[PDB]
Every structure is written in C-alpha cells, then in structure tokens.
Design a binder for this molecule. Structure first.
Ligand SMILES: Nc1ncnc2c1ncn2[C@@H]1O[C@H](COP(=O)(O)OP(=O)(O)OP(=O)(O)O)[C@@H](O)[C@H]1O
Ligand SMILES: Nc1ncnc2c1ncn2[C@@H]1O[C@H](COP(=O)(O)OP(=O)(O)OP(=O)(O)O)[C@@H](O)[C@H]1O
Ligand SMILES: Nc1ncnc2c1ncn2[C@@H]1O[C@H](COP(=O)(O)OP(=O)(O)OP(=O)(O)O)[C@@H](O)[C@H]1O
Ligand SMILES: Nc1ncnc2c1ncn2[C@@H]1O[C@H](COP(=O)(O)OP(=O)(O)OP(=O)(O)O)[C@@H](O)[C@H]1O
Ligand SMILES: Nc1ncnc2c1ncn2[C@@H]1O[C@H](COP(=O)(O)OP(=O)(O)O)[C@@H](O)[C@H]1O
Lengths: 527, 54, 544, 217
C-alpha cells in the first residue's frame, strides 16, 4: 500500500505506465479464484524497446521497488555463453529452478518471480539462420523456448526484455504466448521535458544553489529536441561553467577563493553556453528555415503586406475547415526577386506543430533512385501529425531542366506530380507550398493542373522603395541618402532590378566608395 | 537502356571458433584436487619419520 | 640555522592509533585535534619524521609529521615548497594549518569539517602548467578537455554531492594521421599521479575459444569495482586507454565477420560503461582516424561524452613545435647562431606536427655525415672533429628536399603552372591583377559577404590559367586548392562526383579559403557534334 | 670493454669503417646507396653520448619499390647478412593470416617481443634487430576500400599500426619492405615515424649495364 506513482523519477511516460500496469499486473491483483472462473490466462512475456537514450534502464532498475516480495534477477546478454561444451545451455535452464521448485511445492500461492534480461539482442538472434559455425547460438535459444512455452504449468514468471533494436530478434519469440506485448518508448513531449527538468534539478534547487533568475519554462521551450540523457548532460555543463570561475585550471596553480565557494551559484548565461556545447542526434535541425530568412524582412512596400495577409488567410483556411484536407499553392516570379524567403516567412509565422523544407542542397550527390527514395520518405513521414506545412523549393532544379535537349529526369517529375494529388489518410490536413521561377516551362509540360492558386511577386521598380531599403540598411547619412536618389532620378528613372542584387551592390559600394560613383554606377550597369 | 546491378555468388570465406571437452571441468581433476589430502599424508610421513630420526 | 623560514605553516600528520585493539570508532575531529596539538605543544621546534604521543580523551596516538612547510614572517602566500628534508624545521604557531591524514594503519576516522582544503589525493597536482606538458600548439583544446573532464574531481566532495551530480567518464580524440593525438594520451597517463594505465592495443581482446573474448573485456574493470565497493568515494582514479577503437567496435548489424563476435564485444562494453551498477570513478580514452563507423550507441551521453577534434596546426603552432623539438640542442650549445626559427616556420606551409621531427633528423643527418663520410674516406673519426659539431642553416635548406608534405600536394600544381614566367608586355595585365587583388582584400575584410564568384573569359590560348594562379598565390590564405582535368582523368563517373563533393566539403574547414577551377568546358565533356555532354556533373556544379 | 675518456667509437659497432660499397656486389645503383647509408645507419656509429645529447631517435623504416626483376631482393638479402646483428626474422607475403578467430593478429604480435624484452632488460647497448616484410602489398591495403566481407584487411592493418608506433616506445628494430606497387598501401603507413625513407629502383643506365656485366663475369 505504501506507494503512489508520483513518487518516482520517471517523467513524461505516464501513459506507458498505465498501459503496462493494465496489461501485466492487473490480473494478479485479485485473489486467484476469480481468474480461473474468468477463463483468462496471464501474460508471461514482456518487451520494452526504444531508441538509444530514452530511460528504459532506469525503469528496469527502479521497478523492483514497487513490485513487493524481494528481487528480480538481472543478467547481461553475453554473460550467458560459456567455454565448456554444454555449460552455456545449462546456464539458462539454471535460472528457472527456484521458482519452479517453490511453485511445484506450494501450488498457486507461489510468490511472483520476475526475471529481466537486459540487452536481450546479444544472443537471441533469429535461430533459423546460417553461417554454420559452432551451433551453440542455436541451442541456447531453443533451450529458453522449451522452458518458456511448454512451461508445464509454471504461472508465476514474467520475463522482461530490454533492447535498442527490435528487428534483430527471432520472430519465433514474437508470437502469442511468448512476448505478447511490445511497448515502444519514444522521445518525450514538451511537458515531459519539463518534468525531466524538475526531477533532474530537484536537489540543486532545494539547497539554494541556483539563482532565482533562471526560469525553467523557457529552457524547456528552447530545448526542442532532447532526450533525458542530454538533459542531465546539459545540467552538468551548466554547473561546470559555474564551477570553473573560481578554479582557474592550468593557468597558475589551484587558486581557490575559499570565500566565493560558499557563494557559488549557477546562472542563466552558463546554461546558454551549456546549450552551445551539446548537440542532439535528433538531427532534423529545422533551424534551416531561419537561416533561409537570415537576410530578413523589411517590408519595403504594400505588395509584400498583401501577400502576407493572403498567406494568413490560407493558413486559417486549412486550420478551420474539415472538408479542405489538402491545399497546394504556387509562387512564381522573376529570378532573384526573392521568393523562398517569403514562403519561409509564412511558414515560420504559422506556428504549426510540424514543418520541413526540401531543397536541392540536402538532395545533392545521391544517385537517382536514392533521390526517389528520399522524396518518398519525407512525404510519408509528413502524414502523421494532424496539421502540417511542407515547402518545395525550385522545382525546375529538382527536375534537372536544361534547354539543350531539352533534357531532364522524367521519373522524379512523375513522382512529384503523383504526390501532389494525394489526399492524406483520414483526419489529416496538409498545406503544400511550391516555388518556381520559370513559369512558361511549367505551362508547357502541362502539369499546371495540380495547383489550386498561384501568386505573382513582381520585383521592385520605384526609386522610393529603393530609398526605403537603403534607409533600412543605414547605408549612408541622411544627406547622402537624399543626394543619391536625386541623382538617380535623372540618371535613369526607368528602373527594374530585383532585391538581392540591390543588397549586394549596397555592400560593395559601402566598402569601396560610398559616394554615388560606385553604387549608382553598378545599379546602372545592372539595370 | 541497361547496364550492371548486383552480381557475384561463387565467393565467400568463414572463420571457425572452438569449444572444449567437458570432463575437463575445473582444473582440479586427478593429481590436482587430491593434492590437498595427499599433502596431509605427506606431512604424516614427514612427522612419523621425524619420530624415526629423533 | 634557517635564517628566515622560522614558522610551521602547514603540517600533514599520519595519525596512527597507539594500540590497535583499542580502535575507537567515534568520529575524530581534525579541528579538535589541531587545537589540542597547538594548545598543549606551543613554540616547539619540529622536524619531519618526529614522532609524538598524543593523549586525546584517553585515546592515545602515534603522530608522525610526514611533511613540514617552513615560512618566514611576511609571506602573504605560502609559496615556500613543502620540504620533506629533515633539515627544514619551524616554530609552531597558532596559525599552523594542521592537516591530519590517517596513520599507516589507517585506523582513524578523520573528518573534513568545513576544511576548504585540497582533497586527500587531488590527482591534478595543485601547481601544474600547460607549458610543462611539452605539446606545441593546440593551446585551446586543453582548456575544453581539462575544464569539462577533470574540473569536477579537484573540488571538495561534499559540495559536489550537494550539486547532486556524477562525474563524466568518457573521452575521445580523432583526426587525420600524425597530428599528435597519441602524445596526449601518453602524457596524461604518465603525469597525473594515478594508477598505472592499463593499455590495450586495438585487436588485442579477441580470442580463440568461444566466450573468452568477452571475458577479457570485463577483466579490465575488475580492480575498479573491487576498490569502489570498499572505499567508496575516496578511491583514486583508475584510467584505462583504448587504442584505435574502430578495429573491433563497428556498427553492429553489418555482416562483418560471419561469426558474430563484434556484436558481443560491443554489447559487453555497452552494458558495462553504464550498466545497472554505478562506478563513478573511471575514465576511458580513445583514438581513431574515422569517427563514422563507431556504433551510434557509444556516443550517447554517459559514454564518450566530450569529443574533441585535432586538426593541422597554424603558423604559431609551427613555431611552437620548432621551439619544443630543438630544445636540448640549443641549451647544449650545439646549434649555430645563424638559424632563425621564424623563417623556418614561414617556409613550412602545410607541414603536419609529425613531419617537423623528420626535418630535424635529416638536418642533423647531414651534419653528422660531413664528419664520418661513410664508405670511401673512412676512419676520420677523431676528437677534434666531434668536439665542434654544429648544424648550419643550409643543412635545413638542403633538408627541405628530402621531407615532403602530404597535404600540400595540390599547390605544387599551382606553382608549376607559371613555370613559363610572367611578362608585362601590356598595361592591361596590371589592371587585371590589381582588380583581383582588390576583390581578394574585400573578401578578407568583410564579415557578411561570405561567398564571391568571378569568371575569366577570352580567346583560346590567351594565357588565362596562369593569371588566375598568380592572383591566387599572392593572397597568402591558409587553404588553397585547384581542380583541373588532369586530376580526374581515368576515373569513373560516380568517382568524379564523389571527388568533387569531397573537395567542396573539406573546403569548409579553415576560416579563409581559395578554390580554383580550370577549364570548366572540358570538365563536362563538351563535344559539338551532338552536341553531347554529361548533365549530372553540370547539375552538381551548378548546385555547388 | 669500457668507453675511455677519449671519445672513441662504439665498442660493438655495427658498420665497421673497414667497409666498402664494392664489397656488396651490386653494380649500377650507386647514389641510392649513398642516400640509404646517410639517412639511416649514420646515427648508430657515433658515440651514444653525443647522439643522446642529440635527442633524436633513429629512423625505423625502409621501403623499396620498382619494376619486376631489378634487384630489390638482392639489396634486402645483402643488407640482411653483412651487419653485426641477430638473424633476421623472414616472413613471406601471406604468412601471417591464420585460421582461428584470433591467430593471425597474435602472429603479428609474435614478431617483436624479443627486441621488446631485451630492450627492457638492457637499454641503449642492445644489439639491433631486423625483420623483413617481403611483398608488403598483399594484405596491407587501404582501410575501408575493399568490402572485405571477411574482416582481416582491417584487423591486420590496425595491429601493425598500433604496434609499430604506439603508447610504448621502442627504438632498436629496423623493418624493411619490398613492393611493386606503392599506390595501394594504406596512407597512414607512409608518414614520418613509420617507413620514413622510400626509394624507387629503376631500370639500369648503360654504364650501370657495364657494371653489371663486370660483376656477373
Ligand atoms: N522584402 C523582401 N522580399 C524578398 N526577399 C527579401 C526581402 N527583404 C530581404 N530579403 C532577402 O533577400 C534575399 C533574396 O531572396 P533569396 O535569397 O531567397 O533569393 P531568390 O530570388 O529566391 O533566389 P533564386 O532566384 O536563386 O531562387 C533573401 O535573403 C531574403 O530574405
Ligand atoms: N605537438 C605535437 N604535435 C604533433 N606531433 C608531435 C608534437 N610534439 C611531438 N610530436 C611528435 O610527432 C608525433 C605525432 O604522432 P603521434 O604519436 O600523435 O601519432 P598520431 O599523430 O596519432 O598518428 P596516428 O593518428 O596515425 O597514430 C609524435 O610521435 C611525436 O614524437
Ligand atoms: N600575361 C602573360 N604574360 C606572359 N606569359 C604568360 C601570360 N599569360 C600566360 N603566360 C604564359 O603562357 C602560358 C599560358 O598557357 P595557358 O595554357 O595557361 O593558356 P590558356 O589559354 O589558359 O591555355 P589553353 O591554351 O589550354 O586555353 C604559360 O606558360 C604562362 O607562363
Ligand atoms: N643491380 C643489380 N646488381 C647485381 N645483380 C642484380 C642487379 N639487379 C638484378 N640483379 C640480379 O638479378 C637477380 C634477381 O634480382 P631480384 O630477385 O632482386 O629481382 P626482384 O627485383 O626481386 O624481382 P621481383 O620484384 O620479381 O622479385 C639477383 O639474383 C641478382 O643477381
Ligand atoms: N525521465 C528520464 N528520461 C530519460 N532519461 C533519464 C530520465 N531521468 C534520468 N535519465 C537518465 O538518462 C539515462 C538513460 O539511459 P538509457 O536510455 O536507459 O540508456 P539505454 O537506452 O542504452 O538503456 C540514465 O542515465 C538516466 O539516469
């Protein structure tokens, strides 16, 4: 009775606890008499599995506290094998003796015995295999199966298996009556992330060792992609930045300010540096988006504003209605006018749970079949979360259009055309945003029928907008910014450049000769 | 049209491991575990013959 | 006798218990003992190895002064070396930092009581400097390594316990050959006042009989666990160093062997680094040249946490290496006064850290050969000749012709491209070179303009490539490279793609880089009869 | 014997200054002989006092390559058996590979321990040890290039890399290798510290051809 689930350190994984508890131990709560009158057998086999660094070992270690009587036995996979002929087989069928005897004696009163194989995949590889070395690796697994299936009425045993990779294992362990339930344990959510901070940071918090300045919620918000393992790693990095301010390692000797030791305290900036040190293998790194828009949005005209409101209309549209489960749009305009950034602006402002982008850079260097595979991977993955934003960049480049033949790769084009018309599985919605610069080509391949609506983005032409951007760039002083535009008015009033080129010219002229004679010159040659 | 894609077959190698006789058992097997009780006897000869020489 | 050092500053006493059947289990307070020692015994002269009978609450002791510090009045800091010689003596004062350590018998339950003092066997040896290691360059990575790894072992344990933290227990070093990634492991093993390292060469674990390989990898920790269960935290550090890890610990799941041994060793090591049981006093080192084949699981935090990259040195490091290598020679007066090391550092552009040593060897070899003249003119060895040996600058100049870089193999193409010489038969050339220099400067100074591309075009045979080479050579950038048809000839198409991809990828290391591409047209297989040419290479370039 | 105050050369010298290039019997190749003797053996004739004052370790590697049938094995054999050192430990090409799971790499480890122990016992007065790899280019291939479904191409290379220059130092052996194709050997074997001096042996000159006729007849 002296227990509740709150009192132990596993954060986030509450649902999994409920499922496992309901599947494993519920049947053995009641007096035995009910269950035979209920005509239901107990589950004997358990599998826990997940990626490296999820916390499973902590569960396997701690659960022995809750689960009364005495102690689950623990073994490591490779410990079982042995030198002498026949010893290895003996070893496995030596574990079951005690419970067998006790049970055989006492009938159903037997105390429940638990055994846990950590690192199961060591030796239980798929028995129907070849390589034809010494056959010990077969005998072993056969032995377990004999003791596990034809148990001869041994109904007080739960075997628990821990692994990092389910696939390796014999399918002849994955069947009813033997390892029935398989529990997947995946990366924590944001709330679980907060509990992991809570549990890791307990002690240091009580003892007045962290400055009140720190606020856990924002740290949890930032750390979008971390398993618990990394979380304690980050904690120790932050603590270390704290400790290293008194002890100056290397330089000089050990200079300990005995006084400052009492005042030692971690602070927020330490945590930021700690963040700067560690890096997850979570790997998606969708910060890609922000580096795309690193040149930024200055909103130099109304056209951008109108476009942004239209994008807002569509994101609301897909969010609200239930019959619109798929919307696609095309964004076209002159080259270098700057298109990808605008779509990125829409996407980042959207704030959906789910985003990715596809761009030739990540695609670079594979062979064709690998391209095809990658593209498929990304689409299928996108279908999971309820609401999803996905961006396709520079289609023409993905298809390898060159006008000589004209030559290009058909298969990828077909794949994309088919993919864009796929309504997702039930009760998902999707928003697909594609950009291009060579509209006529798209017209002539005649795939223009797969786009619901299209957006033009003309480049800038009026000297006033130039004045806006250049005041934003702080190119020159006020009089300078006036005189240049006055001179440009008569030098070449008709004007058509773009945006990217304008920034490039601005920088070149800024360094070299920020008078008219360079910036205006380059702008004229370009125009 | 066509080219290469998967080929070989007749070509593979294998290493080979090895276990050992069981009787081997623990090192103590004849003239090993008996040396414990054979020593007490030999200490007996030493003594009884210490009586002899004295 | 002493002159100035007349007081006892800090005294470390091995407090054996008098009679060992009387062993009192009650906690012994170092503060009470120090106060009693001063109060009862004041203004006495003590020397190292003086033994004393200390009666504290009827529990006698055999105090032995292991060591004594002698300090003069007026010393704010005790910079005087703690002297183990019996000659040093002092006068006990009310300020003596009295440290008690357990006797030889270890029977006394001494406690630290707010004693903000060095831990009993603080491994890092309180006065210790990077210059004494003997490693030139890489003066930053030592900060990362020592800060992250050993910073937390020095600090007193109770506070660390208050933090509620566990020590790191992994360390990895990787890089290209010859950069000095083995020297560090050795000197760290040797200079840290720990147990002797348990060295293992890479494929030294595996063994014939089934089940003997794994047994070996778990014999290495046996002493550690044996000690830890007994003495707990006051264990001294055990260090075991793996050499050349990727031999055995590949990604499990491949078809490496056909037997299934690699998986087992991986499994055992994985289970034992973290496992169910806590060790908290162990450290493992690694070295390798390829970081990509290690099974991913090893790299999760808790195992091989901090990973450090070792790359080729810059100029300052090169100067430091010459300073370290040619150390004994100078102080033994065997060196001509004419050599100036800065110029040597300047000449050796792409030399690695392992090549300078061969240079020294070759230079000396010339010197010695001048005397012996192996072969024909034998037996000239005599005292006069060997009594005035000195290396000269031209020996090093000669030595440059024997040792050759390994990474600086593509710039040779550039310097030979202008073998024909250069002539300034027209004004135009000067304008062009000046413009190029302007652009080079520009990319050098700026911060936000991180990519600039230029093109050179004109009629065939006009002498284009040489001009680019001259522009490139005068920049002085650390990293220069050239891609030309000569390199790619004979390869297969996929190999070409791979090669170009790799070239761009390793062009992302140095802060400043210059890259030259020769005759794009021929790279893409242009022939006008079709015309025909290879799309894939084109697209790759256009993307890149 | 004992080293007097006067700096006389080593008691148990290796090269014996009553030595001559025409004793070998290899005609033609002449400058290469000069190079090899200059770079490698010079350090071991002078008194240890100076050379230790000179704080340099002797070179511990030699590589010979060239077309087939030029004289490589002749050089190796001659250098083998007109010096003052223990008998070389010859090994033909694929002699190392062995059956059981850990026998090949033990076989590489077998070659060096004698020098190791003797070095521990005495030190700088050790006799030199020589080991000859005939035909290096069979097993020591680039790592990660051959699929090597049979994993012997990597364990062998790693063992030799670790043990020729490892955590523990050893400076009284000399390893010399012969090959026809140096383009496939692993690159880490060709840095200073391992196989320092590399020599090409080419087809003979006309005057060399005269020399060869003189030798043979
Ligand atoms: N109002 C703006 N509209 C568009 N881009 C802007 C604006 N303000 C700043 N920028 C920046 O100008 C740059 C030009 O856009 P970008 O680099 O995407 O070029 P692009 O036209 O998409 O190139 P490409 O023709 O290769 O597709 C981006 O960094 C973008 O963020
Ligand atoms: N600071 C230094 N950097 C590099 N090398 C140094 C340095 N100081 C001395 N050396 C010499 O250069 C050699 C560097 O080689 P090292 O022992 O690190 O092998 P390595 O670089 O690990 O090669 P591999 O990675 O192939 O084993 C050392 O043997 C040492 O004698
Ligand atoms: N401005 C110059 N003044 C004097 N010599 C030059 C000049 N430019 C090039 N050269 C010399 O003329 C030769 C240039 O030949 P190179 O093959 O580089 O010309 P190219 O036109 O780039 O080659 P290709 O004929 O393949 O196009 C080199 O030997 C170089 O030394
Ligand atoms: N330069 C030379 N001087 C004297 N004899 C020579 C010379 N070159 C070759 N020979 C003769 O050629 C014979 C064989 O030489 P060797 O065995 O070295 O050829 P190799 O280079 O080993 O050929 P492979 O590389 O095929 O083994 C020797 O016995 C030797 O008498
Ligand atoms: N709530 C948590 N979630 C995940 N990991 C945690 C949590 N709390 C603590 N940890 C730490 O993370 C590590 C988990 O290691 P684990 O993932 O079990 O390795 P493996 O997956 O190889 O078994 C443990 O050291 C544990 O102390």
């Amino acid at each position: 009775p002296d227990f509740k689930f709150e009192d132990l350190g596993v954060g986030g994984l509450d649902k999994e606890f409920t499922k496992i508890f309901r599947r494993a131990f519920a049947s053995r709560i009641f007096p035995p008499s009910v269950i035979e009158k209920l005509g239901i057998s107990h589950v004997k086999g358990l599998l826990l599995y997940g990626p490296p660094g999820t916390g499973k070992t902590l569960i396997a270690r701690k659960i022995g506290t809750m689960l009364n009587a005495k102690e689950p036995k623990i073994v490591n996979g490779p410990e079982i094998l042995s030198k002498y002929v026949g010893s290895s087989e003996e070893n496995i069928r030596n574990l079951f003796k005690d419970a067998e005897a006790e049970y055989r004696a006492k009938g159903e009163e037997s105390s429940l015995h638990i055994i846990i194989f950590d690192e199961l995949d060591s030796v239980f590889k798929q028995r129907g295999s070849r390589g034809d070395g010494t056959g010990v690796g077969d005998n072993v697994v056969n032995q377990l199966l004999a003791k596990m299936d034809g148990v001869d009425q041994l109904n007080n045993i739960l075997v628990i298996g821990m692994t990092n990779r389910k696939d390796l294992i014999d399918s002849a362990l994955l069947r009813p009556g033997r390892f029935e339930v398989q529990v997947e344990i995946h990366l924590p959510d944001e709330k679980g992330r907060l509990q992991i901070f809570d549990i890791q940071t307990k002690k240091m918090r009580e003892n007045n060792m962290m400055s009140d300045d720190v606020n856990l919620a924002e740290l949890a918000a930032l750390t979008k992609n971390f398993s618990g393992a990394e979380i304690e790693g980050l904690v120790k990095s932050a603590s270390s930045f704290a400790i290293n301010k008194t002890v100056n390692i290397g330089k000089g000797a050990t200079k300990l300010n005995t006084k400052d030791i009492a005042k030692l305290k971690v602070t927020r900036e330490d945590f930021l540096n700690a963040l700067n040190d560690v890096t997850p293998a979570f790997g998606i790194s969708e910060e890609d988006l922000k580096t795309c828009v690193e040149g930024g949005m200055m909103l130099y005209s109304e056209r951008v504003n109108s476009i942004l409101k239209n994008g807002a209309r569509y994101v609301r549209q897909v969010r609200e209605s239930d019959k619109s489960r798929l919307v696609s749009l095309l964004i076209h305009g002159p080259a270098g006018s700057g298109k990808t950034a605008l779509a990125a602006e829409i996407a980042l402002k959207s704030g959906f749970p789910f985003i990715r982008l596809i761009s030739p850079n990540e695609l670079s260097g594979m062979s064709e079949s690998a391209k095809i595979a990658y593209i498929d991977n990304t689409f299928r993955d996108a279908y999971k979360s309820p609401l999803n934003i996905l961006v396709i960049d520079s289609l023409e480049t993905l298809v390898d259009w060159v006008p000589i033949g004209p030559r290009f790769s058909n298969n990828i084009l077909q794949m994309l055309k088919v993919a864009l018309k796929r309504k997702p599985p039930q009760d998902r919605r999707l928003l697909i945003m594609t950009t291009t610069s060579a509209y006529s080509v798209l017209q002539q391949m005649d795939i223009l029928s797969c786009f619901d609506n299209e957006i033009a983005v003309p480049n800038m032409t009026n000297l006033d907008e130039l004045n806006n951007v250049m005041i934003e760039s702080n190119f020159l002083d006020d009089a300078g910014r006036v005189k240049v535009i006055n001179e440009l008015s008569r030098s070449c009033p008709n004007f058509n450049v773009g945006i990217k080129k304008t920034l490039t010219n601005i920088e070149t002229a800024r360094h070299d000769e920020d008078p008219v004679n360079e910036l205006v010159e380059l702008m004229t040659q370009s125009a | 049209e066509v080219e290469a894609a998967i080929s070989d077959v007749g070509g593979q190698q294998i290493f080979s491991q090895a276990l050992l006789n069981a009787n081997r058992r623990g090192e103590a097997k004849t003239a090993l575990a008996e040396v414990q009780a054979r020593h007490q006897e030999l200490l007996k000869l030493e003594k009884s013959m210490a009586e002899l020489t004295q | 006798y002493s002159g100035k050092q007349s007081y006892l500053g800090s005294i470390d006493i091995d407090i054996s218990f008098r009679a060992r059947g009387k062993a009192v289990s009650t906690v012994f307070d170092q503060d009470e003992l120090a106060k009693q020692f001063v109060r009862c015994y004041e203004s006495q002269i003590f020397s190292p190895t003086q033994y004393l009978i200390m009666e504290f609450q009827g529990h006698f002791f055999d105090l032995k002064i292991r060591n004594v510090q002698a300090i003069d009045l007026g010393d704010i800091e005790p910079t005087s070396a703690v002297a183990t010689g019996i000659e040093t003596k002092g006068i006990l004062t009310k300020q003596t930092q009295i440290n008690f350590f357990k006797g030889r018998d270890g029977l006394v339950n001494l406690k630290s009581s707010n004693s903000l003092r060095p831990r009993s066997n603080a491994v890092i040896r309180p006065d210790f400097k990077f210059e004494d290691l003997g490693v030139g360059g890489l003066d930053k990575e030592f900060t990362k390594i020592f800060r992250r790894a050993f910073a937390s072992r020095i600090f007193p344990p109770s506070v660390i316990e208050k933090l509620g933290i566990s020590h790191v227990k992994g360390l990895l070093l990787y890089g290209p050959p010859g950069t000095g990634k083995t020297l560090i492991a050795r000197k760290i093993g040797t200079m840290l006042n720990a147990k002797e390292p348990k060295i293992v060469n890479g494929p030294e674990i595996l063994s014939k009989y089934v089940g003997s390989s794994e047994e070996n990898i778990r014999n290495l920790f046996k002493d550690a666990e044996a000690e830890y269960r007994a003495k707990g935290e006051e264990s001294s550090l055990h260090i075991i160093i793996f050499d050349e890890l990727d031999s055995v610990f590949k990604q499990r799941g491949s078809r490496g062997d056909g037997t299934g041994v690699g998986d087992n060793v991986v499994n055992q090591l994985l289970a034992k680094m973290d496992g169910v049981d806590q060790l908290n006093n162990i450290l493992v080192i690694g070295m390798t040249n390829r970081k990509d084949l290690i099974d991913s699981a090893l790299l999760r935090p808790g195992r091989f946490e901090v990973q450090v990259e070792i790359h080729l040195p810059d100029e300052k490091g090169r100067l430091q290496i010459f300073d370290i290598q040619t150390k004994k020679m100078r102080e033994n007066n065997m060196m001509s006064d004419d050599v100036n090391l800065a110029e040597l550092a300047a000449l050796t552009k792409n030399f690695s850290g392992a090549e300078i040593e061969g240079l020294v060897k070759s230079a000396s070899s010339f010197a010695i050969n001048k005397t012996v003249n192996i072969g024909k003119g034998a037996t000239k060895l005599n005292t006069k000749d060997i009594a005035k040996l000195k290396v000269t600058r031209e020996d090093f100049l000669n030595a440059l012709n024997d040792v050759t870089p390994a990474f600086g193999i593509s710039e040779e193409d550039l310097k030979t491209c202008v073998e024909g010489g250069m002539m300034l038969y027209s004004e135009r050339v000067n304008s062009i070179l000046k413009n190029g220099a302007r652009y080079v400067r520009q990319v050098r100074e700026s911060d936000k303009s991180r990519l600039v591309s230029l093109l050179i075009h004109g009629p065939a045979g006009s002498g284009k490539t040489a001009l680019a080479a001259e522009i490139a050579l005068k920049s002085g950038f650390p990293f220069i490279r050239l891609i030309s048809p000569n390199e790619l000839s004979g390869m297969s198409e996929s190999a070409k793609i791979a090669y170009i991809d790799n070239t761009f990828r390793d062009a992302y290391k140095s802060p400043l880089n210059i890259l030259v591409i020769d005759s794009l047209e021929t790279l893409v297989d242009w022939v006008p009869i079709g015309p025909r040419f290879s799309n894939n290479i084109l697209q790759m370039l256009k993307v890149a």
